[PDB]
């Protein structure tokens, strides 16, 4: 999964509020995002097939993201 880089991981962590990272964070973050992307894509692509299309829409992804589960910090 060479798409995501060490600089990228750092950028994400800094917006997260992080101050220091273990060396093992880079290998770990990659594994996590590999799973996350494989899952959302797999579903979005199935959605595209079931609509009899070969062009993936934002709504295909929007629907696949509702399936994976979205989190919020607090209630509504």
């Amino acid at each position: 999964i060479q798409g995501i880089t060490k600089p990228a991981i750092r950028r994400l962590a800094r917006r997260g509020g992080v101050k220091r990272i273990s060396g093992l964070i880079y290998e770990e973050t990659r594994g996590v995002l590999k799973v996350f992307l494989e899952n959302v894509i797999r579903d979005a692509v199935t959605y595209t097939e079931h609509a009899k299309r070969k062009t993936v829409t934002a709504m295909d992804v929007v629907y696949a993201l509702k399936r994976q589960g979205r989190t919020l910090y607090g209630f509504g």
Binding site: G17, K19, V56, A58
Partner: protein, 84 residues
Amino acid sequence: IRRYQKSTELLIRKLPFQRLVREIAQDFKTDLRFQSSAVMALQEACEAYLVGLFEDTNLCAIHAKRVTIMPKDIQLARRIRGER
């Protein structure tokens, strides 16, 4: 009053991300096109998902009175969100 200067933010680079999407999507279904807004939605998802994951890792560290975050704090962040 204080005025803010505006600027796009940089988490993950776009072109590498698009190539990553193509890689994975190829294994599920060959000869398959993406709308730009779809790939972007996929990126926005990943980026906010990982940023939130790190926010948990940050909060775990501050209360546990640590400086360095560990893969275990990511594992916890993943757990509280449902995945095994």
